[PDB]
Structure formats: C-alpha cells, structure tokens
Amino acid sequence: NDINAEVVSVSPNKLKISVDDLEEFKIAEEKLGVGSYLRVSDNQDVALLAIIDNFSIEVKESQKQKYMIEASPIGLVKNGKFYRGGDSLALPPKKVEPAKLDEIISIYSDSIDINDRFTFSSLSLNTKVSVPVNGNRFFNKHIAIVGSTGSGKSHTVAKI
Amino acid sequence: NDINAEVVSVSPNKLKISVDDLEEFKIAEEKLGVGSYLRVSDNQDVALLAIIDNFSIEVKESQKQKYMIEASPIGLVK
Amino acid sequence: KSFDDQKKETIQIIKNHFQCEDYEAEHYLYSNAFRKTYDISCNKKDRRIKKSDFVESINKSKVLFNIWFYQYEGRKEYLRKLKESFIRRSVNTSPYARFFILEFQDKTDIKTVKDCIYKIQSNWSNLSKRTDRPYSPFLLFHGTSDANLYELKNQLFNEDLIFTDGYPFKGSVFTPKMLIEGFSNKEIHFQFINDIDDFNETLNSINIRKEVYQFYTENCLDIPSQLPQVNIQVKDFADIKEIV
Amino acid sequence: RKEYLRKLKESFIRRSVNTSPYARFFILEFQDKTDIKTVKDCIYKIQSNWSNLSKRTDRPYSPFLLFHGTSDANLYELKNQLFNEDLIFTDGYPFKGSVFTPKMLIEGFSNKEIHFQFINDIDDFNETLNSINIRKEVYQFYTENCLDIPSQLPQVNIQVKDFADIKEIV
Amino acid sequence: KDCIYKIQSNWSNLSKRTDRPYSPFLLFHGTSDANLYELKNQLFNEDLIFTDGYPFKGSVFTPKMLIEGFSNKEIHFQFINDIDDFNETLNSINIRKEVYQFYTENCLDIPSQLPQVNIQVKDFADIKEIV
Ligand SMILES: Nc1ncnc2c1ncn2[C@@H]1O[C@H](COP(=O)(O)OP(=O)(O)O)[C@@H](O)[C@H]1O
Numbered sequence: 001n002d003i004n005a006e007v008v009s010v011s012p013n014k015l016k017i018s019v020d021d022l023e024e025f026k027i028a029e030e031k032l033g034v035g036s037y038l039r040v041s042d043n044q045d046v047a048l049l050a051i052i053d054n055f056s057i058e059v060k061e062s063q064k065q066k067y068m069i070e071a072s073p074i075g076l077v078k079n080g081k082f083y084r085g086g087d088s089l090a091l092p093p094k095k096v097e098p099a100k101l102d103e104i105i106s107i108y109s110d111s112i113d114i115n116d117r118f119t120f121s122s123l124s125l126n127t128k129v130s131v132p133v134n135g136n137r138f139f140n141k142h143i144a145i146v147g148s149t150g151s152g153k154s155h156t157v158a159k160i
Numbered sequence: 161n162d163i164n165a166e167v168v169s170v171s172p173n174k175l176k177i178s179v180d181d182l183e184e185f186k187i188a189e190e191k192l193g194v195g196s197y198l199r200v201s202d203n204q205d206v207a208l209l210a211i212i213d214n215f216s217i218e219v220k221e222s223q224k225q226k227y228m229i230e231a232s233p234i235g236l237v238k
Numbered sequence: 239k240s241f242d243d244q245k246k247e248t249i250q251i252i253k254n255h256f257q258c259e260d261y262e263a264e265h266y267l268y269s270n271a272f273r274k275t276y277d278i279s280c281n282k283k284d285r286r287i288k289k290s291d292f293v294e295s296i297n298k299s300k301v302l303f304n305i306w307f308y309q310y311e312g313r314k315e316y317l318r319k320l321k322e323s324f325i326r327r328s329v330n331t332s333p334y335a336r337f338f339i340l341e342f343q344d345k346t347d348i349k350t351v352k353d354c355i356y357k358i359q360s361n362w363s364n365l366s367k368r369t370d371r372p373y374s375p376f377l378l379f380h381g382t383s384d385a386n387l388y389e390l391k392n393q394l395f396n397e398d399l400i401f402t403d404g405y406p407f408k409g410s411v412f413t414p415k416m417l418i419e420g421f422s423n424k425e426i427h428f429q430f431i432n433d434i435d436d437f438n439e440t441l442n443s444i445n446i447r448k449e450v451y452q453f454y455t456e457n458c459l460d461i462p463s464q465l466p467q468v469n470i471q472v473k474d475f476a477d478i479k480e481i482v
Numbered sequence: 483r484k485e486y487l488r489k490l491k492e493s494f495i496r497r498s499v500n501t502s503p504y505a506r507f508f509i510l511e512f513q514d515k516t517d518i519k520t521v522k523d524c525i526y527k528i529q530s531n532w533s534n535l536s537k538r539t540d541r542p543y544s545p546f547l548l549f550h551g552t553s554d555a556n557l558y559e560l561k562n563q564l565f566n567e568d569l570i571f572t573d574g575y576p577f578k579g580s581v582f583t584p585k586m587l588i589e590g591f592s593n594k595e596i597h598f599q600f601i602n603d604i605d606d607f608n609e610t611l612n613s614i615n616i617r618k619e620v621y622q623f624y625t626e627n628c629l630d631i632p633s634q635l636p637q638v639n640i641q642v643k644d645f646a647d648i649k650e651i652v
Numbered sequence: 653k654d655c656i657y658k659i660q661s662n663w664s665n666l667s668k669r670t671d672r673p674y675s676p677f678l679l680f681h682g683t684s685d686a687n688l689y690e691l692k693n694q695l696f697n698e699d700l701i702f703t704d705g706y707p708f709k710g711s712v713f714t715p716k717m718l719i720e721g722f723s724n725k726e727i728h729f730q731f732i733n734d735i736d737d738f739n740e741t742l743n744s745i746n747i748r749k750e751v752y753q754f755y756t757e758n759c760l761d762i763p764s765q766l767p768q769v770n771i772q773v774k775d776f777a778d779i780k781e782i783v
C-alpha cells in the first residue's frame with residue numbers, strides 16, 4: 001500500500017517502528033513528522049496511538065531504505081473513544097498507519113466536556129482538526145505564555 | 161504452558177528474564193508489565209519474588225522473538 | 239409509562255431469568271425474545287402461548303435480526319453495538335483458528351462479497367515477515383451455486399489474494415493439512431473452506447483454540463456447540479463488513 | 483538388453499552435458515497396462531536428474547511432466563500419490579474450480595520448494611508454451627502413440643519397448 | 653552384523669553437513685526371537701543405536717518412533733520386529749518407500765504398491781558386498 005510500517009521493538013513508554021515500503025512520499029512529509037500520530041494495531045476498532053518523538057532515515061549502497069521511527073504510546077482508542085494511559089502494551093509486530101482524522105479529533109473531544117470546550121487554535125501538523133482546551137482548567141490554573149521576540153506571543157495572548 | 165520465562169543472568173540486585181514462548185497474550189498485558197510481581201523458583205515451595213523494572217520485546221526477520229524482562233529480587237517466599 | 243423507562247426493566251427481568259453475564263442480556267436474550275414475541279403476536283391463528291416453552295425456544299446460540307431497532311438507531315448505530323457485543327477485540331490478537339461462515343446467495347453479487355473477504359483478511363490476520371506465529375482467517379461460504387462459488391474464488395486469485403482450500407491440484411482429494419500450514423503460512427492470505435464435509439474435517443485437525451464467527455441472512459448451519467460461536471443475522475451481505 | 487539401453491541414453495539424452503536452467507518438457511505415454519508403481523519410479527528419476535533446487539544455486543529449474551493416453555481415474559490417483567510422498571508439484575490449478583493458470587507453472591519452475599510441474603492434457607501444454615519465455619526442450623517418450631509437437635520447438639522422440647526401460651534412459 | 657554394518661554405512665547419511673538425513677529400515681524373518689533379541693542386544697552394545705517403536709518395556713507399537721529415528725542423526729538404523737510392525741510403519745511413512753529383499757529359501761510377501769527387488773543368495777555371507 002502507500003505506507004508499510006510496523007513495530008520492531010517496544011519499551012515501557014516507547015516503541016521503535018520500522019517503515020518498510022513508504023510508497024507515497026506525501027505520507028512521510030506531514031503524517032510521519034515529529035509529534036505526529038500513528039495507529040498501532042492489527043485491526044480497525046481497537047488501537048494504540050503514539051507521538052513520534054524521533055526518526056532516523058538511513059540510506060546506503062545496496063541494502064534497503066532504513067526508515068526507523070521512535071514513538072511513545074499516548075493512550076488507547078476503542079471504537080472511536082479515546083482512553084488516556086500508556087499502561088497498554090502492544091506485542092510486536094503491530095501494523096502502523098498514520099492516524100485518521102477521527103482519532104485525532106477524538107483525542108481532544110473526549111477528555112473535555114462539550115460545554116467546557118474552548119477552541120482558539122488548531123493542530124500544526126493537521127490543520128483540519130481543531131484543538132479545544134478545557135476552558136475551566138485553562139483559566140483557574142494560571143497561563144504562562146512564553147516566546148521569543150517576534151514569535152507571536154502577544155498575538156496569541158489577544159486571540160485567547 | 162501459557163508462559164515460559166526464565167532467568168538467564170543474575171546480579172546482586174538485578175535479574176535478566178527471557179520469555180521463550182508467550183503462548184497466552186493476556187499474561188503479557190497485565191502480569192508482565194513494569195511493577196508486576198514475578199515468581200522466580202524451580203519448585204512450588206521456595207521462591208524469590210521480583211519487581212519488573214524494565215522490558216524489551218524485539219522482533220526481527222528470521223530468528224525468534226527476543227523478550228527480555230529486567231527485574232530485581234525483592235524477597236523470599238518459604 | 240414511556241419506552242425509555244420500559245427499556246431497563248425488560249433488560250433486568252431477563253438478566254436473572256437465565257443467570258447470564260452482563261452484555262448477553264442486552265442483545266442476545268432481549269433481541270431474541272422481542273422477535274419471537276412479535277412472531278406470535280402477528281400470528282392470527284395462535285396468540286395464547288404459555289411461557290414454559292418460551293424459555294427453551296429463546297435459549298439458542300442465535301442472534302436474530304429485528305426490523306424495529308434497525309429503523310430506530312439506524313444502520314450506523316445498530317451495527318455499531320453489534321461490533322462491541324460479540325466481536326470485541328484487544329490490541330494483541332492471539333493466533334487463534336478463526337472460522338468465518340458467511341451466507342452467499344444469488345441476490346448478492348460478487349462485488350459486495352469481495353470486500354467483506356478483504357475486511358476479514360485485513361483485520362483477522364498477521365502475515366508479517368517479522369512475526370513467529372502468523373495466523374490467517376478461515377472462510378466458509380454456503381447456500382450458493384458452485385458456479386458462483388468458483389466465480390468468486392477465481393477473481394480473488396487475480397488480484398494477489400493467495401488462498402488454499404485443501405485441493406492443491408486438479409482431481410485432488412480433500413487434504414486438510416494444506417489448510418493447516420496455510421494458517422501458519424505468511425504467503426497464504428486466508429483459508430477458503432469449500433463444503434460442510436470440508437468444514438467438519440478441519441476442526442479435527444486443529445489443536446489450537448478455535449473460533450467461529452457466523453454472519454448469515456436466512457439459513458444457519460449446525461456448528462458443534464463446544465466451539466465458541468457467534469451467529470448473527472444480517473439483512474444483506476453489506477452489513478457483514480461493518481461488523482467484522 | 484543391456485546393449486540396447488546404452489544406445490538411446492548416449493545418443494539423445496546427454497544428462498551430464500545439459501545443466502542449464504531451461505524449461506525442459508517430459509511427455510510420457512501412460513497406458514492402462516503400466517501400473518502406477520513404475521510411473522512413480524520414472525518421475526522420481528526425472529526430477530532427481532533434470533532439476534537443481536540446491537540452496538547454493540541462483541538459477542533453479544524443475545522439469546515439466548505431461549502424461550497422455552491414460553484415463554483421468556489413474557492420472558489423478560498418480561497425482562494424489564505423488565503429493566503424499568512430499569513430491570510437491572503444481573499444474574496450474576491452485577484451488578478447486580480454478581481455471582488453468584500458467585503463472586503458477588512460471589513461478590514453480592523457479593521455486594526451490596516445488597520439485598516439478600504437472601500438465602494434465604494437451605491444451606494445458608499448449609497454453610503454458612506461450613507463457614514460458616525462455617528456451618524450451620521437449621523430450622517425448624512413447625511406446626505406441628506419439629503426440630504432436632509444434633515445429634518451432636526443439637523436440638526429441640524416443641521409442642521404447644515399455645515403460646520400464648524409461649528411467650534408465652533418463 | 654557385518655551385513656547390518658554394511659547396510660548402515662552404505663545406506664545412511666547421518667553427517668552434520670546435510671539437511672535431509674536418512675537411515676535404513678531393517679527387518680528379519682525366519683528366525684526365532686531368542687537369537688533375534690540376542691542380535692539386537694549385541695548391536696546396542698557396539699554403539700549402533702537403533703529403534704523399533706518400543707521405547708519402554710510393555711509398549712504398544714509406536715510407528716512415530718521410527719519416523720523420528722529416520723531423521724535422527726544419532727539413530728543409525730530402524731529395526732522392525734516382524735510382519736505386523738512392518739505393515740504398521742508402512743502406513744505411517746508418507747515419503748517414498750523401497751523394499752530390498754535378500755532371501756535364501758523363504759521369501760516374504762510385500763505389498764504390490766511398493767518398488768521391491770528380490771535377491772536370491774546361496775547363503776547370508778554374500779549379502780554383505782551386494783549392498
Ligand atoms: N495564529 C497565527 N498564525 C500565523 N501567524 C501568526 C499567528 N499569530 C501571530 N503570527 C505572526 O507572528 C508575528 C509576530 O508577532 P507577535 O508574536 O505578536 O510578536 P511578539 O510575540 O514579539 O509580540 C506576527 O507578524 C504575526 O504575523
């Protein structure tokens with residue numbers, strides 16, 4: 001298919017993922033970057049989700065394209081409902097795909113109630129998913145907005 | 161045998177446990193995690209109990225699955 | 239007394255009637271009892287039925303379809319709870335001998351059948367070259383003509399979906415061993431069981447844990463009771479893909 | 483008897499000379515007077531001599547087997563026996579009800595786990611002939627009835643008293 | 653024993669270099685069990701390890717013990733006690749079987765589905781260098 005990736009080794013809080021084919025180059029550009037989401041399972045109803053922390057793409061003379069992805073599990077998805085917690089263990093090998101838009105939507109639209117949603121931004125790697133924060137816990141626990149000069153910190157301040 | 165795990169290296173406060181079979185996948189999910197309790201013995205009378213500190217399950221092309229469990233001895237059951 | 243308050247009392251009264259577990263009473267006993275009550279309420283010849291024989295007629299390993307919830311929560315939601323009732327999965331799927339028995343009729347063409355096989359093969363198999371215990375699903379089809387059955391099998395081989403049936407050559411007797419090794423073969427995507435006599439032979443050749451997932455419309459086949467069974471009525475073959 | 487068998491082995495077969503991975507076709511005359519036993523001894527002699535499936539090679543090859551003049555009752559019975567003694571073959575029919583697929587004969591020729599290739603009858607043989615691209619040779623072995631061969635293929639015809647002398651020539 | 657050692661040495665490949673080893677099957681007939689067991693005892697003491705499907709005392713005939721011993725490099729050959737064990741291990745072996753008969757006066761009856769040769773000899777001594 002377009003992408004053929006699977007988990008080659010697991011850790012308590014980390015997964016090594018090897019990309020084997022990578023037929024479509026546009027998958028790697030946005031959906032395989034650092035901080036992106038991967039679906040780690042063998043079925044299409046129950047899965048792990050993982051932040052890509054690091055990757056290393058080695059190429060050489062005659063052996064194959066060595067695409068290694070280091071990922072850390074962030075939680076569980078069961079029938080479209082996201083559960084936090086890295087306690088779940090995926091026994092290798094597990095087929096790895098970039099997460100579709102519904103899982104990424106279900107990450108932020110599950111831990112926060114619909115009336116408590118306060119949306120002022122969208123995800124950087126995927127524009128089509130908006131990120132809501134719990135506007136209750138956004139303002140009680142104080143906000144520390146940090147950036148360099150010319151980074152957009154004041155434009156972020158006024159937009160909130 | 162649902163599980164086949166066995167100590168392959170011993171330190172003063174550390175053990176290296178290799179899982180050979182892992183026939184039942186359910187044992188690895190809730191009984192082989194970090195902080196779980198392992199029974200290290202060759203009989204069902206006297207044993208060493210251990211806390212799982214680390215684990216690593218590597219798979220490669222041809223040879224078998226390498227499941228390594230890092231544990232530390234925490235006491236004795238008589 | 240509305241419908242929502244009558245929902246939980248009818249569920250609760252059947253829970254201790256059979257002394258069953260939690261999620262059986264939601265869909266396996268209540269939906270079974272709703273059809274047979276309607277099948278005798280609409281009967282203009284007999285209405286007064288004692289409940290002594292109603293218990294034994296309900297307690298069969300069968301999940302029948304009823305029109306009235308399919309209209310109520312719709313096709314997106316009625317098939318949704320059918321996935322979480324008997325088709326529950328974990329992250330690590332154990333290499334079990336899973337048998338998928340699907341009803342093939344002449345009303346359903348090949349195209350609505352083929353992606354169901356693709357749905358079963360993609361979800362219930364791990365043919366990775368890195369694993370040490372690969373598994374592949376077992377496929378059974380019934381109620382169809384042999385010309386239509388061979389028609390489906392021919393087009394599966396032309397789009398790189400390699401399967402085995404225990405007939406490795408023309409004129410071969412049914413050898414179930416090639417079905418057994420194809421379960422552990424990474425190059426064999428799934429297993430195609432031809433007939434019932436073909437089916438009853440390969441349970442006896444399997445020592446690992448076995449599972450049957452039956453998805454049918456009209457006619458059920460008497461699978462032996464000591465295997466774990468999932469027998470589900472559907473309207474047509476299009477719903478089977480959304481459950482598996 | 484011995485001096486008769488020596489002539490056809492040296493003149494036509496040349497077993498030691500031909501080691502190249504060619505698609506060699508062996509057409510055999512199966513009749514009712516020849517039992518299955520001596521047919522199996524010939525097939526094992528053909529497969530052992532005219533195939534190379536050792537792991538050291540890079541260009542494996544397997545022979546092609548065709549039988550004619552016999553009924554389908556003992557042709558399938560010979561095929562059923564040959565599969566039980568771990569002599570794995572393909573004949574273009576990977577499943578029941580399949581059409582003849584020559585690509586299974588293409589891949590089985592280069593497959594080390596597949597010892598030889600079976601051909602059921604004449605039109606199966608003609609169909610894979612257009613599917614092999616590499617050089618093909620036909621070694622026809624017959625007793626009373628000879629088969630037609632296309633005139634563009636390298637063909638040898640060998641006449642024998644019966645089926646028992648055949649494995650000596652191969 | 654000279655015929656058995658010549659059969660064992662010529663018709664087996666138990667080296668570590670190969671990946672498909674094989675060992676011959678031995679059958680004897682026409683003799684009593686007194687010297688048949690005495691021959692079996694003498695062969696085992698000379699480190700000629702064999703099997704006959706009877707791994708322990710009072711055992712039912714186990715044809716799979718001859719199956720593993722055929723592929724075992726540590727088992728030099730397979731013994732067969734009599735006709736009843738011969739037909740039982742015949743149906744258990746799926747791979748190609750050949751029967752080689754070397755008889756002087758009495759010839760056993762072999763099933764007609766197996767490739768069999770019959771050899772007539774003046775005595776037992778000349779059987780050794782035929783094989
Ligand atoms: N949501 C946004 N999308 C794109 N560009 C932005 C956004 N917010 C701020 N910027 C850009 O960031 C630049 C820096 O402005 P700002 O962050 O307010 O500086 P400072 O943080 O030093 O006050 C601006 O020129 C503006 O174009």
Ligand SMILES: [Mg+2]
Nearest residue numbers: 152153154155
């Ligand atoms: Mg500012």
